[PDB]
Amino acid sequence: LAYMEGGALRSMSDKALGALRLAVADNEHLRDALRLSEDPKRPERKVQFFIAVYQHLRERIRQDIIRTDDPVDAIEQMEIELARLTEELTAREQKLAI
């Protein structure tokens, strides 16, 4: 993005914030951090929000079965878990039927 004027950057930021609004509807702490982050005179808050995201995304890892501190690398582990749980669901359905 180093070679793009500021107006387009503002537009992408606006669209991303619009998406985040829907995305973080459920959470309250992340929602509050986002609501703080839009003050143009406190830029660091935005950065903090990102940290607050990753930080949060780490605590809810459920590290009991996951290890990757980086949430980006935990998508594979969640996919593994969904596949395993689909197998377990099939087994449970058969057991309930019998």
Binding site: A2, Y3, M4, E76, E79, I80, A83, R84, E87, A91, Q94, I98
Partner: protein, 247 residues
């Protein structure tokens, strides 16, 4: 300078995408040809993992089929044994011997032979009409005559031997039943054994899930590489503009 600046953003985005893609892999890419050999290695790993996954899946399916075969009403040839059992006022012999001990279970199973799973019908004349109708049934259906509640032991030409039983099934004909393990009769701990089968299949399913996830990961990596090359090759491995622009 303006030409290089115009070229810049495309090159920079390409470099970032390529770096992410390669770092995701253990290897670092340096050429279009190198990307092609990486694709070939990806295909090799995929065509391997799929074979192991299918083999594990076949083993798994066999395990669940075996587990089910022991399920209901009392683990037996319940595919048609059910209808064959309630359609006539009889009771499964295996169920009749459901509570026999694990020790007497092998002896009685060997004694009864292929007739272990038979159905007790004191008349044998209820099945006489329906016999012609039966075209969907186990290739060898077994029936015994007596009181289902208190059936008297089938009279046999039995002859017990060490961990086995000889029997004379018909004139000049002997069947020698070696004491089986984990028999048909005594279907109380056989439920425990099908539980053991479930335990066994747990690891099979775990391994199958790991193989399936590996297959999915390789597929997604290949698709990402394809999309990359679709958007990316035009500027891949080209010189850095930023240094030129600064100079």
């Amino acid at each position: 300078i303006q030409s290089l600046t115009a070229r810049a953003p495309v090159w920079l985005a390409a470099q970032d995408t390529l770096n992410q893609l390669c770092e995701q892999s253990g290897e670092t890419l340096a050429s279009s040809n190198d990307v092609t050999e990486y694709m070939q290695q990806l295909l090799e790993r995929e065509r391997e993992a799929t074979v192991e996954r299918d083999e594990v899946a076949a083993q798994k399916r066999e395990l669940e089929k075996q587990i089910e075969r022991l399920s209901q009403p009392s683990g037996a040839e319940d595919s048609r044994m059910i209808a064959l059992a309630e359609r006539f006022g009889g009771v499964l012999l295996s169920e009749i011997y459901d509570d026999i001990t694990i020790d007497d279970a092998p002896y009685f199973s060997a004694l009864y032979g292929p007739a272990r799973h038979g159905i007790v019908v004191p008349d044998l004349s209820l099945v006489r009409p329906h016999l012609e109708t039966l075209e969907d049934c186990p290739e060898d259906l077994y029936l015994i005559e007596g009181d289902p509640q208190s059936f008297d032991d089938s009279v046999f030409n039995a002859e017990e031997q060490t961990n086995a039983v000889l029997v004379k099934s018909s004139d000049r004909q002997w069947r020698y039943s070696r004491y089986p393990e984990l028999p048909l009769f005594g279907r109380a701990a056989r439920e425990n054994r099908l539980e053991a089968l479930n335990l066994e299949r747990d690891a099979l399913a775990e391994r199958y899930a790991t193989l399936s996830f590996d297959v999915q990961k390789i597929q997604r990596a290949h698709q990402a590489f394809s999309q990359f090359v679709g958007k990316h090759l035009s500027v891949a491995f080209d010189t850095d503009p930023e240094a030129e622009i600064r100079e």
